């Protein structure tokens, strides 16, 4: 197992761990406000990050590294829907940047299996970016209050 | 026999339920009359819940050899629009949970642990209703009154 | 809506609310005593009164009146089976007298829909009277202890 | 068959015939405009009036009168949703006034079967008035645009 | 590892369960022998209920690293006719609920909230049993003994 | 009903009552240690003794004796698996010796129905002896740790 | 919501969050080693703590407090089965100590619903303690290699 790939994998894992907690708190904030459609979708984003974390832990162990679940970076918590969506988007853009750098390194040392795992995680992060950007655009097109109204009921 | 002051408390809680039954049922039918059928149906289910709480209170009172008091009906808090009605229900529930907390203190003090457990089950349900009410009031502010009513027209 | 019909309807509603609470207490007393068949039949009487009140509240609102659920008249509570049944029978006879007077006024002002609602309620209150007098008569024909024995188990 | 009862029934029938055409045209206007939920409900109001007419026709023939499907009174056609609902409401209020006078006459000559038919029709017309007043009320509470938005899709 | 006095209370409750098990089983089989099969069946199910309580107490005592006492059997209260047997069961239950209340107080004092919740569940069941017994005794007075027994011949 | 048969039946019943409690405690001990296969089997042994006690009680009542559920003899409680199994085995050998004397006495006074009941219970105790002796022999053949390992999981 | 109760709830939440990561890493270490039955049971312990965490966050938000998902305390990671089980046990004993103190405070300020939630979590934690002490006892009774052998396959 290449020491620097393992480092990259733990960096990605650290980003997942941030996103699990940020999205889960955002989910329960929306549910508490009665915006249950947003809350449910955000919950599923949290679950996806949990599964990404699982696969990174498994790969790190296989490569004989030490998965780092101890270091938890800064959660970006908003206080209304629009800030929450933008905080999620900022966290995702950072995450895809780290994924690109880790893929470069995997290719360099010929760890093609790790690359393929990171590429699958990256496809899903870009789908998340697409979702978040689409929501911010909808808020502009239909208005904030209409947008929130359409995310009250599941 | 039951402790006389526990029975007193239980009859106080029962009196609160009886207010809530009538207040929520009328509010339900006002919302249905207005064509706000989603609010009406939810409020109907709140009224049903209080009916079931009253039933369990009546049964416990009788087991404790008290006289259940269904004669004294306190003051209903009837609003005339959706905002007032939600706030009236919230005001009733806040008083209701305060009385439930005092009743639980007294059950614990005389070691009536079954009655305490009944009252805690009712209390958890009242706190869920408070959560529902504060959420609806909060949503009115976020989405606008007219949008909120619109969303509660159709089941 | 005619103001005097609304008053009449609120008077019928007031009787229903007495009956609801009287029958519900009587039901739970019989249950507490282990007379579960009596308790169960009295429960369904209470439910029937609940359903009458519902229809009255709906009609009052449509006629642009204010349903009165605040005023609760005197419950007639008995302390044994024979008294409870007679208390219920007394309440029903008062209720049918009020219903007839309301039907007369509905007819006079041509509120035929309210009349028809009150007539449906009146048929149901006559069936309850029939039930009650029948129970009172069975107590005489089979004896009190036998009558109670036969209403122990559902 | 009493001549004046039959004349009353033919009057009620004439009101039904106006209502059939007015509600059907209003339904198809709303469908044309893409307000398909309003259109579907107005269609069902039209169908109900068709069934009332059918029953009145059968009764008139049994009483050996001549059902009058030739005279069509004035259709009250609105140009927008508010006017259209109010036009229906004005038609219904006229229909219920005529129904009450017909019921009076049925009672006075002891045609109790014709009375009961007219009362069943009256119960349905007061439900329709309830519908119409509720919709005009919702336009006030939720705003016209929102109300129309909520009745686009079935 | 569990609290010594909680364990002693739990063993005391268990001893009460072991008396009820045997007392209710014997009464059940006496009623069956006499052809009062409805009373025999209900009394059997009361005995089974006590067996399940005993089981939960034994498991909890072991988890707390105490020694379940199944050796000491106190006095069965056996009646010789239906009215005595119901009253003996009732007298046993009233003793059992007094002891349950004292054990719950001790659990609360030392913060053994899980043992308290178990005892509260048992107490709920014993008050349901007290309700059954007082109701049967009240029915003997209301319908007469002979009618009462008649109604409990067939299942 | 012969007084000495009844004494014999109460003696067997007294043995069943010891066994019920001894086996139930041993079952829950094994369950608590996580030897859930030993614990489940011992639970079923306790259940069987409960069913023997039931049949004995019914027989004693029919013979117009008084069933003695009051006097509970000494439970033999071991502190590890090998002792617990040997304690059960010692209890069973005492029980079968008492059964044999009870059957002799039933045969002598021609209580053939009681004898046949005792023979059925005796058949079941000898199956329990077989189980216990078999478990003790398996401990010698496969070793204690393997024997316990094989009875962790149901 | 009482500020000190919210502090207690956030402290319990903080313990849940340690347990999530510690149990999930331990689960995946056991799966990596081929001890898949140990890994699967540890995964379900991790899921349980995720659910507790969820209930705490919902209650804190309802009490109008701020759930703290940012502070992650120290994971106790073992390097073999016996150390990992003991690290989970040490974490659980600390968690039940904090739960008892939080329940005391809920009682004192009459927040009986929060107490009931904490009591439910506490019952689950005591079941986890029972599992953990049972596994440690079994290692002693059947020996380590036997115990690990029995937890290779699911
Ligand atoms: C002392 C007062 C009352 C008590 C104790 C009581 C109790 C109950 C109970 C136990 C039920 C069955 C709930 C279930 O398990 O689903 C019920 C049903 C119902 N109650 Fe009440 N109730 C009371 C007053 C009222 C009032 C004042 C109204 C209306 C104005 C009402 C309307 C209804 C209706 C419509 C149902 C459903 C009936 C059906 O369709 O089956 N109740 N009530
Ligand atoms: C320490 C005392 C006892 C304990 C802990 C105990 C425990 C149990 C348990 C847990 C059950 C299962 C009930 C269920 O879940 O449905 C049971 C069943 C039963 N018990 Fe006991 N019991 C005890 C004493 C007795 C005694 C003394 C008798 C009779 C004299 C008895 C007769 C029965 C019978 C007939 C059953 C049903 C068995 C079947 O499935 O056929 N038990 N017992
Ligand atoms: C190390 C961090 C975490 C990891 C690796 C992780 C992993 C997982 C996995 C693999 C699942 C199953 C998903 C599926 O396949 O459907 C899951 C479920 C779940 N997680 Fe997490 N999780 C973590 C943190 C959290 C946190 C911090 C919370 C809440 C505050 C949480 C809440 C949940 C919930 C509610 C479920 C669904 C469980 C159920 O009800 O079945 N997770 N987690
Ligand atoms: Fe909520
Ligand atoms: Fe991810
Ligand atoms: Fe790199
Ligand atoms: Fe792949
Ligand atoms: Fe993501
Ligand atoms: Fe959406
Ligand atoms: Fe809603
Ligand atoms: Fe309506
Ligand atoms: Fe309530
Ligand atoms: Fe008090
Ligand atoms: Fe409970
Ligand atoms: Fe409530
Ligand atoms: Fe009862
Ligand atoms: Fe009625
Ligand atoms: Fe009048
Ligand atoms: Fe009708
Ligand atoms: Fe009635
Ligand atoms: Fe019975
Ligand atoms: Fe079209
Ligand atoms: Fe019509
Ligand atoms: Fe006329
Ligand atoms: Fe008819
Ligand atoms: Fe119409
Ligand atoms: Fe609509
Ligand atoms: Fe469309
Ligand atoms: Fe028999
Ligand atoms: Fe018990
Ligand atoms: Fe104590
Ligand atoms: Fe519990
Ligand atoms: Fe009991
Ligand atoms: Fe265990
Ligand atoms: Fe046996
Ligand atoms: Fe002998
Ligand atoms: Fe045989
Ligand atoms: Fe045996
Ligand atoms: Fe295992
Ligand atoms: Fe693997
Ligand atoms: Fe937990
Ligand atoms: Fe504190
Ligand atoms: Fe709860
Ligand atoms: Fe735990
Ligand atoms: Fe394998
Ligand atoms: K809108
Ligand atoms: K082996």
Swiss-Prot record, chains A, C, D, F, G:
GO cellular component: cytosol; ferritin complex
Sorted UniProt keywords: Cytoplasm, Heme, Ion transport, Iron, Iron storage, Iron transport, Metal-binding, Oxidoreductase, Potassium, Transport
Keyword Acyltransferase: no
Signals that turn on the gene: 24-fold increase in transcription in response to iron treatment.
Cofactors (names): heme b
Industrial and biotechnological uses noted in the record: Small molecules designed to bind BfrB at the Bfd binding site (derivatives of 4-aminoisoindoline-1,3-dione) cause cell death in model biofilms, and are bacteriostatic in planktonic cells, suggesting these compounds are potential antibiotics. Model biofilms were tested in strains PAO1, PA_1081725 and PA_1076058.
Location in or out of the cell: Cytoplasm
Effect of residue 66 to A: Assembles into normal BFR with wild-type ability to oxidize Fe(2+) and store Fe(3+), 5.2-fold decrease in rate of iron release from BRF, greatly reduced affinity for Bfd
EC numbers for this chain: 1.16.3.1
GO MF annotations in UniProt: ferric iron binding; ferroxidase activity; heme binding; iron ion binding; iron ion sequestering activity
Domain Ferritin-like diiron, residue spans: 1-143
Main localization category: cytoplasm
Subunit architecture: The bacterioferritin (BFR) complex is formed of 24 subunits (FtnA and BfrB) arranged as 12 homodimers. The holocomplex contains about 8.7% Fe and 8.0% phosphate. A pure BfrB BFR is a hollow shell with an external diameter of 118 Angstroms and an internal diameter of 73 Angstroms that binds 12 heme molecules and up to 600 Fe(3+) ions per subunit. The BfrB-only BFR has twenty-four ferroxidase pores which serve as a conduit for Fe(2+).
Protein's name in the database: Bacterioferritin BfrB
Gene assigned in the entry: bfrB
UniProtKB/Swiss-Prot annotation, chains B, E:
Record InterPro entries: Bacterioferritin (IPR002024), Ferritin-like (IPR012347), Ferritin-like_diiron (IPR009040), Ferritin-like_SF (IPR009078), Ferritin_DPS_dom (IPR008331)
Gene encoding the protein: bfrB
Organism of this sequence: Pseudomonas aeruginosa (strain ATCC 15692 / DSM 22644 / CIP 104116 / JCM 14847 / LMG 12228 / 1C / PRS 101 / PAO1)
Residues binding Fe(2+) Fe2, per UniProt: 50, 93, 126, 129
Main location: cytoplasm
Gene3D superfamilies: 1.20.1260.10
Biotech relevance: Small molecules designed to bind BfrB at the Bfd binding site (derivatives of 4-aminoisoindoline-1,3-dione) cause cell death in model biofilms, and are bacteriostatic in planktonic cells, suggesting these compounds are potential antibiotics. Model biofilms were tested in strains PAO1, PA_1081725 and PA_1076058.
Domain of life of the organism encoding this protein: Bacteria
Subunit record text: The bacterioferritin (BFR) complex is formed of 24 subunits (FtnA and BfrB) arranged as 12 homodimers. The holocomplex contains about 8.7% Fe and 8.0% phosphate. A pure BfrB BFR is a hollow shell with an external diameter of 118 Angstroms and an internal diameter of 73 Angstroms that binds 12 heme molecules and up to 600 Fe(3+) ions per subunit. The BfrB-only BFR has twenty-four ferroxidase pores which serve as a conduit for Fe(2+).
Listed SUPFAM superfamilies: Ferritin-like (SSF47240)
Catalytic activity reported: 4 Fe(2+) + O2 + 4 H(+) = 4 Fe(3+) + 2 H2O; Fe(2+)(in) = Fe(2+)(out)
Annotated phenotype, changing residue 84 to A: Assembles into normal BFR with wild-type ability to oxidize Fe(2+) and store Fe(3+), 5.5-fold decrease in rate of iron release from BRF, greatly reduced affinity for Bfd
Protein name per its UniProtKB record: Bacterioferritin BfrB
Listed cofactors: heme b
